Design an enzyme around this catalytic site. Structure first.
Site, PDB file in Angstrom:
ATOM      1  N   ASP A  32       0.859  -1.179   0.000  1.00 26.60           N
ATOM      2  CA  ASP A  32       0.000   0.000   0.000  1.00 26.60           C
ATOM      3  C   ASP A  32       0.902   1.237   0.000  1.00 26.60           C
ATOM      4  O   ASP A  32       2.013   1.194  -0.556  1.00 26.60           O
ATOM      5  CB  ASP A  32      -0.979  -0.100   1.214  1.00 26.60           C
ATOM      6  CG  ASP A  32      -2.316   0.538   0.989  1.00 26.60           C
ATOM      7  OD1 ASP A  32      -2.338   1.802   0.823  1.00 26.60           O
ATOM      8  OD2 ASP A  32      -3.388  -0.200   1.004  1.00 26.60           O
ATOM      9  N   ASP A  40      -1.343   2.441  18.241  1.00 21.57           N
ATOM     10  CA  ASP A  40      -2.205   1.239  18.168  1.00 21.57           C
ATOM     11  C   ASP A  40      -1.775   0.246  17.114  1.00 21.57           C
ATOM     12  O   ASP A  40      -2.548  -0.634  16.791  1.00 21.57           O
ATOM     13  CB  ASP A  40      -3.721   1.656  18.036  1.00 21.57           C
ATOM     14  CG  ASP A  40      -4.705   0.714  18.770  1.00 21.57           C
ATOM     15  OD1 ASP A  40      -4.279   0.067  19.747  1.00 21.57           O
ATOM     16  OD2 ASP A  40      -5.903   0.696  18.398  1.00 21.57           O
ATOM     17  N   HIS A  62      -3.906   5.869   3.615  1.00 22.34           N
ATOM     18  CA  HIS A  62      -4.615   4.676   3.193  1.00 22.34           C
ATOM     19  C   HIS A  62      -3.996   3.415   3.794  1.00 22.34           C
ATOM     20  O   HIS A  62      -4.719   2.610   4.385  1.00 22.34           O
ATOM     21  CB  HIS A  62      -4.605   4.698   1.672  1.00 22.34           C
ATOM     22  CG  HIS A  62      -5.423   3.647   1.038  1.00 22.34           C
ATOM     23  ND1 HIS A  62      -4.901   2.444   0.618  1.00 22.34           N
ATOM     24  CD2 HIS A  62      -6.707   3.673   0.601  1.00 22.34           C
ATOM     25  CE1 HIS A  62      -5.835   1.752  -0.019  1.00 22.34           C
ATOM     26  NE2 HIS A  62      -6.962   2.455   0.022  1.00 22.34           N
ATOM     27  N   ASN A 153     -13.869   0.040  -6.676  1.00 22.96           N
ATOM     28  CA  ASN A 153     -14.923   0.915  -6.275  1.00 22.96           C
ATOM     29  C   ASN A 153     -15.742   1.550  -7.390  1.00 22.96           C
ATOM     30  O   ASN A 153     -16.412   2.592  -7.174  1.00 22.96           O
ATOM     31  CB  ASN A 153     -14.380   2.009  -5.346  1.00 22.96           C
ATOM     32  CG  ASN A 153     -13.612   1.469  -4.156  1.00 22.96           C
ATOM     33  OD1 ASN A 153     -13.903   0.422  -3.623  1.00 22.96           O
ATOM     34  ND2 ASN A 153     -12.558   2.175  -3.754  1.00 22.96           N
ATOM     35  N   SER A 215     -11.167  -1.219  -0.415  1.00 25.37           N
ATOM     36  CA  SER A 215      -9.875  -1.210   0.310  1.00 25.37           C
ATOM     37  C   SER A 215      -9.998  -1.469   1.794  1.00 25.37           C
ATOM     38  O   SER A 215      -9.048  -1.928   2.418  1.00 25.37           O
ATOM     39  CB  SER A 215      -9.183   0.082   0.170  1.00 25.37           C
ATOM     40  OG  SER A 215      -8.761   0.315  -1.145  1.00 25.37           O
TER      41      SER A 215
HETATM   42 CA   LIG Z   1      -6.537  -0.796  20.302  1.00 27.08          CA
END
Ligand SMILES: [Ca+2]
Ligand code: NA
Length: 269
Positions: A32, A40, A62, A153, A215
């Site tokens: 990507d 996170d 993205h 898409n 995606s």
């Molecule tokens: Ca988390």
């Protein structure tokens, strides 16, 4: 507080987590725009194939978003990935603009095969075929990688490349009702669908954002593949693909949905 995005619950990932399945020990490459460091996410390595953009950090957003749908960490913040313990590799094949070349993508697929990736997530596509891409999808497959790719898409009844190639597992998008998202390409070669509307995930700047697209669907399936692979470490890419399809929740109309909605609980039962 951690939030569980609707689509993570819809694919029943938490059920898998409660069986001790998190994707631990499963190598997932995100091909990507890169993956930006984020509280996170845990990014374990990767590479860039984009001329002039040698970092694996994400200058678009993205790739980071896709990565959190796969593997946002299970903790007291942010969101939660399908496979929160998967080993994430940032393989930058698309530039900060969101676009890349057949050459970059093929190079990323070569890297994924050579570095023993179990899953490669390709949330990317074009309407035009590429022999180079086909060869590279086949290469990664021969080297044991499960290639998972977005259907596109455009809303048309044929799917994008490389998802249209047989050795790419093609993923479409459903809405919050499990109906086909209006934009989700469908037709011959579609394998499976997953949540792709109003999908919250990680985003550059240590923040979160909601996006729509095939995606966003694709990483739910890449994450599910990782759960299955943790459960069944002897299984091939094809065995995993087949099991995901065979355990998906049928939505009928395979032209629109393939085998149906990916179901991580059924896949790990
Ligand atoms: Ca988390
Ligand atoms: Na395909």
């Amino acid at each position: 507080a951690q939030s569980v995005p609707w689509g993570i619950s819809r694919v029943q990932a938490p059920a898998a987590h409660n069986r001790g399945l998190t994707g631990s020990g499963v190598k997932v490459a995100v091909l990507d725009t890169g993956i930006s460091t984020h509280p996170d996410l845990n990014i374990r390595g990767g590479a860039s194939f984009v001329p002039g953009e040698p970092s694996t950090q994400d200058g678009n957003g993205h790739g980071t978003h896709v990565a959190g749908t796969i593997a946002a960490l299970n903790n007291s913040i942010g969101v939660l990935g399908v496979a929160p313990s998967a080993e994430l590799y940032a393989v930058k094949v698309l530039g900060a603009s969101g676009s890349g070349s057949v050459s970059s993508i093929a190079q990323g697929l070569e890297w994924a095969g050579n570095n023993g990736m179990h899953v490669a997530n390709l949330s990317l596509g074009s309407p035009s075929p590429s022999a180079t891409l086909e060869q590279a999808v086949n290469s990664a497959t021969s080297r044991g990688v499960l290639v998972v790719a977005a259907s596109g898409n455009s809303g048309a009844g044929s799917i994008s490349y490389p998802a249209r190639y047989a050795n790419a597992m093609a993923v479409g998008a459903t809405d919050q009702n499990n109906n086909r998202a209006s934009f989700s390409q469908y037709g011959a070669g579609l394998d499976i669908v997953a949540p792709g509307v109003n999908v919250q995930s990680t985003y550059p700047g240590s923040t979160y954002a909601s996006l729509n697209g095939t995606s966003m669907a694709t990483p739910h399936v890449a994450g599910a593949a990782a759960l299955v692979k943790q459960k069944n470490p002897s299984w091939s890419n094809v065995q995993i693909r087949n099991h995901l399809k065979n355990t998906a929740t049928s939505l009928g109309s395979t032209n629109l949905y393939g085998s149906g909605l990916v179901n991580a609980e059924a896949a790990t039962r």
